Design brief:
The complex is a heteropentamer of chains A (about 180), B (about 90), C (about 150), D (about 375) and E (about 100). Helix content of chain A is about 25%, strand content about 25%. Chain A has helices spanning about 15-30, 100-105, 120-125, 145-155, 165-170; strands spanning about 5-15, 40, 50-60, 60-70, 85-90, 95. In chain A, strands 1, 2, 3, 4, 5 and 6 form a six-stranded antiparallel sheet that branches. In chain A, a hairpin with a 2-residue loop joins strand 5 and strand 6 (about 95). Chain A is elongated and about 70 Å long. With about 90 residues, chain B is an alpha+beta fold. Chain B has a single domain (about 1-90), classed as Ubiquitin-like (UB roll) (Roll). In chain B, a hairpin with a 2-residue loop joins strand 3 and strand 4. The termini of chain B are far apart. Chain E has one domain (about 10-95): Potassium Channel Kv1.1, Chain A. Chain E is about 45% helix and about 10% strand. Chain E has a three-stranded mixed sheet. The radius of gyration of chain E is 14 Å and the shape is globular. Chain E starts with 12 loop residues before the first strand and ends with a helix. Classes of the chains: A alpha+beta (about 180), B alpha+beta (about 90), C alpha+beta (about 150), D alpha/beta (about 375), E alpha+beta (about 100). Chains A and C meet through strand 1, strand 5, strand 6 and helix 2 of A and strand 3, strand 5 and helix 4 of C. Strand 1 (about 5-15) of chain A pairs antiparallel with strand 3 (about 60-65) of chain C, so a sheet runs across the interface. The complex binds zinc ion (3 copies). Chain A binds one RNA strand of 8 nucleotides through helix 1. Chain D: GO terms for molecular function: cytidine deaminase activity; dCTP deaminase activity; identical protein binding; RNA binding; zinc ion binding. Chain D: It catalyses: a 2'-deoxycytidine in single-stranded DNA + H2O + H(+) = a 2'-deoxyuridine in single-stranded DNA + NH4(+). Chain D: Keywords: Antiviral defense, Cytoplasm, Host-virus interaction, Hydrolase, Immunity, Innate immunity, Isopeptide bond, Metal-binding, Nucleus, Phosphoprotein, Repeat, Ubl conjugation, Zinc. Chain D: Its main location: cytoplasm.
RNA sequence: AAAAAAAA
């Protein structure tokens, strides 16, 4: 009898980034209402031997799961990259692995503040524009010239501590 | 590929090409728009005239010199005026 | 399905290009070479541990976990495997996946003498029509959207 | 950056030893340095400070080792003993770096006392700890839990306590024993052969066996098969009464039941917990075990006893009620004694040597237990 | 580039700067703008857009077409606040 | 009593 497996795409990250990601998610779930509605699952809520934590993000009627992983031997020689992250988009029994940048883009469709439709019209009438975008990781593609110009003339907000980003969590630093 | 700027007589064309393309290829590119034979023209870079036989590598210009966000600028002439763009 | 194939062929893909890429087994980096080969081969035989393969020049890695760890087994219209028979000194890896909404097969081979090899990605035509159409459409609609100038002030 | 002492409120806030505390974001390291030989006052003693989320170079452990490497040069033909009292146990990176540091330096011994264990459930931290401490081919580093005496020493020598006596908080002994069991589990501590031989003898007439030992292992159900959870395995003993510890001493069974809830077992799965005891449970411990088993329907209990502990006849009632709750009670035979020797003892490769009359005593005890569980 | 602008299939649309400069850019690149796409005759004259604004919008055409499909390591697109409002006006007019 | 821990 042949063996069976599940195959994942795991981004190799260092434990410090995972700690910060956890801290930011918790801070914006509880202290700020910005990430309110997200769910955090502790390591002891998962039977998986390697799962370290899960973050579930409702996206309308679908769901985005960010999973962190423990005890992967793949860790680097210096153990720069012992741990790992994976991203999934689930709806009912359908699932798909998701790119980190597309993950941030999908997140920004639902949660944080962005320029409103009247932002352009207000800007050319010389008025003040509000709300203004505060999540620049959600605009990682090549956007319209309108968005680039507007973001140029009015600067985005810089939340402290920074809003949680899947792109920043899983960005290649060891190899650069 | 890279993108190029050619400005002369308040006239300009925006086009892309390859790295090792010789200046003859650039003149062929501008021919289809200017209806003027290639070898007659001579390009200009940094107010320096360009001879008929010239190559990117020989010229020293590289891909990092010409970007979609900041393409290399060179002038053109017929048988030169580096006219600046408008200002706010 | 035509949209999926067009995406696969024409889209900057996921950061994991379909072109052949050199991959290596990363496990037990520290231990000596012979120990690494022995442990890797034993894991490939048993099916009880996990095995990871990293693209040499990037951050992406493919992880095979035992299907038991996941808990409830997942229905598999297509078959993944880690074969050790087609060649004396090579292991062949086949892994179906769904990436960014398009179904693909990742195929690789590792040489146990050197513990490295080559992997590539191809389009999967069989399961695309078997997967739920509503979920495909929902994800497609979601990814086509932009946050900008969307909210009604 | 060092301070001579800390204020009373700082000490009480940071060295509180509840295993799971939030909002303790600073690490305090009280250190003493002495020279090997007859007891004498420390050559140097101070306190380092750090934040858990700061840069690794700014962690108190790294700062101590940087200071020590330079200060160590004044007399290199000197061999030193170093003692740490630290509120949080070092992190994974610090553990690895200290392992390297101690490998570099042969003439230095390090003993660490910790109020709490930081991230004790992380497999990578557990591996790093085993590398630092358990490995006898590695550095000579000891790690222990702070008890009453250590807390009192810190209050006396590292706190601004103006003629004020140390006052323990409520559950100091309870938390200490929980953390001691957890650390022994992580470090895979083993029983020495003499203790096993003296305590697990099944001769009916025993003299001087006043303490009860208990070796535990856990199994999980999957695919109609019992798979060992190698993490959950260890041994423990009863706590003798102490004025600073438990006034009336705690029985091993109660400590075991206390530690079980910290494992965070999944209520939707099935587990089997196997215990090997030198004495069978007393009446009160049997009642407590029966109540636990009744409440936690997802756990099955198996007890293998070397002897039957009887007193006043309530012990038989206790065994009967514990059995009726759903536990399985048996008598250790050759197989179980050998398994315990090979699993929980530091045998150093030596084989299990049975003593005189083992099998006859096992048979007599099995008959007695059958009579007890059948007669009511 | 043998494609003849004068012909129906031009390969190049002519853009006239209100200031007095004229550029020319491929039909595909102009297709990324709604207004010019709807209009396109092979010549376009803009009433208001200055020369430098036209240059920046055309450079944006080039940039987006180059990186429309790439989603990896997209480079920055420089902008300056003194030109941001007029560039935004041009973009709103062109529906870029 | 709770804190799985940069939720300060
Ligand atoms: Zn936004
Ligand atoms: Zn540390
Ligand atoms: Zn008892």
């Amino acid at each position: 009898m042949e063996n069976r497996w599940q195959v994942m795409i795991v981004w190799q990250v260092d434990r410090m980034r995972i700690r910060t990601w956890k801290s930011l998610v918790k801070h914006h779930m509880y202290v700020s209402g910005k990430a309110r509605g997200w769910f955090y699952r502790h390591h002891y809520e998962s039977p998986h031997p390697r799962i370290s934590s899960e973050v579930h993000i409702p996206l309308g009627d679908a769901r985005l799961v960010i999973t962190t992983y423990w005890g992967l031997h793949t860790g680097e020689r210096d153990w720069h990259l012992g741990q790992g992250v994976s991203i999934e988009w689930r709806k009912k029994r359908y699932s798909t692995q998701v790119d980190p940048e597309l993950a941030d883009q999908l997140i920004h469709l639902y949660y944080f503040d962005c320029f409103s439709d009247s932002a352009i019209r207000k800007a050319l009438l010389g008025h003040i524009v509000s709300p203004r975008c505060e999540y620049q990781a959600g605009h990682n593609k090549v956007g319209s010239l309108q968005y680039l110009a507007l973001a140029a003339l009015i600067t985005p907000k810089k939340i402290k501590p920074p809003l949680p980003s899947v792109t920043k969590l899983t960005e290649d630093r060891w190899n650069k | 590929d890279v993108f190029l700027m050619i400005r002369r007589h308040k006239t300009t064309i925006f086009t892309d090409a390859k790295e090792s393309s010789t200046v003859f290829e650039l003149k062929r590119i501008v021919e289809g728009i200017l209806k003027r034979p290639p070898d007659e023209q001579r390009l200009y870079k940094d107010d320096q005239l360009l001879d008929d036989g010239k190559t990117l590598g020989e010229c020293g210009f590289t891909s990092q010199t010409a970007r979609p966000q900041a393409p290399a600028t060179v002038g053109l002439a017929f048988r030169l005026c580096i006219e600046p763009f408008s200002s706010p | 399905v035509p949209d999926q194939r067009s995406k696969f062929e024409n889209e900057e893909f996921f950061r994991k290009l379909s072109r052949e890429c050199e991959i290596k087994y990363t496990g037990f980096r520290d231990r000596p070479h012979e120990e690494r080969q022995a442990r890797f081969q034993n894991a490939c035989r048993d099916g009880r541990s996990e095995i990871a393969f990293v693209a040499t020049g990037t951050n992406l890695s493919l992880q095979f976990f035992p299907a038991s760890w996941q808990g409830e087994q997942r229905q598999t219209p297509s078959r993944e495997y880690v074969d050790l028979e087609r060649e004396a000194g090579k292991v062949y890896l086949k892994a179906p996946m769904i990436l960014n909404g398009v179904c693909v097969i990742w195929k690789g081979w590792i040489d146990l003498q050197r513990l490295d090899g080559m992997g590539c990605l191809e389009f999967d035509e069989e399961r695309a029509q078997q997967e739920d159409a509503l979920a495909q459409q929902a994800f497609e609609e979601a990814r086509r959207r932009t946050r900008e100038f969307e909210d009604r002030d | 950056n060092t301070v001579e002492r800390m204020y009373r409120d700082t000490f009480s806030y940071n060295f509180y030893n509840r295993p799971i505390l939030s909002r303790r974001n600073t690490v305090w390291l009280c250190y003493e340095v002495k020279t090997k030989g007859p007891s004498r006052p420390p050559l140097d003693a101070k306190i380092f400070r750090g934040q858990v989320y700061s840069e690794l170079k700014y962690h108190p452990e790294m700062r101590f080792f940087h200071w020590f490497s330079k200060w160590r040069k004044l007399h290199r033909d000197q061999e030193y003993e170093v003692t740490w009292y630290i509120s949080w146990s070092p992190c994974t990176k610090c553990t690895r770096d200290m392992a390297t540091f101690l490998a570099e330096d042969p003439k230095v011994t390090l003993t660490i006392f910790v109020a709490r264990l930081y991230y004790f459930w992380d497999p990578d931290y557990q591996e790093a700890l085993r590398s630092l401490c358990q490995k006898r081919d590695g550095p000579r580093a000891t790690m222990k839990i702070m008890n009453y005496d250590e807390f009192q020493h810190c209050w006396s020598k590292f706190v601004y306590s103006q003629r004020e006596l140390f006052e323990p908080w409520n559950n100091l002994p309870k938390y200490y024993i929980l953390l001691h069991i957890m650390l022994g589990e992580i470090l895979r501590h083993s029983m020495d052969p003499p203790t096993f031989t003296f305590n697990f003898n099944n001769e009916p007439w025993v003299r001087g066996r006043h303490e009860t030992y208990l070796c535990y292992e856990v199994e999980r159900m999957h695919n109609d098969t019992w798979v060992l959870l190698n993490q959950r395995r260890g041994f423990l003993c009863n706590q003798a009464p102490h004025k600073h510890g438990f006034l009336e001493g705690r029985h091993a069974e109660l400590c075991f039941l206390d530690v079980i809830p910290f494992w965070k077992l999944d209520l939707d799965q099935d587990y089997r917990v196997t215990c090997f005891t030198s004495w069978s449970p007393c009446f009160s411990c049997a009642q407590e075990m029966a109540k636990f088993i009744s409440k936690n329907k997802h756990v099955s209990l198996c007890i293998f006893t070397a002897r039957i502990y009887d007193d006043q006849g309530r012990c038989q009632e206790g065994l009967r009620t514990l059995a009726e709750a759903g536990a399985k009670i048996s008598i250790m035979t050759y197989s179980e004694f050998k398994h315990c020797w090979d699993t929980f003892v530091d045998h150093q490769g030596c084989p299990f040597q049975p003593w005189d009359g083992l099998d006859e005593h096992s048979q007599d005890l099995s008959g007695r237990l059958r009579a007890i569980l059948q007669n009511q | 580039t043998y494609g003849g602008c004068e012909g129906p299939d031009a390969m190049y649309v002519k853009l006239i700067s209100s200031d007095g400069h004229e550029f020319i850019v491929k039909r595909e690149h102009a297709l990324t703008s709604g207004t010019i796409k709807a209009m396109l005759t092979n010549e376009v004259n803009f009433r208001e857009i200055p020369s430098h604004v036209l240059s920046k919008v055309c450079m944006y055409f080039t940039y987006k077409v180059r990186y429309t499909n790439s989603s990896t390591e997209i480079p920055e697109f420089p902008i300056a606040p003194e030109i941001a409002l007029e560039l935004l006006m041009a973009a709103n007019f062109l529906d870029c």
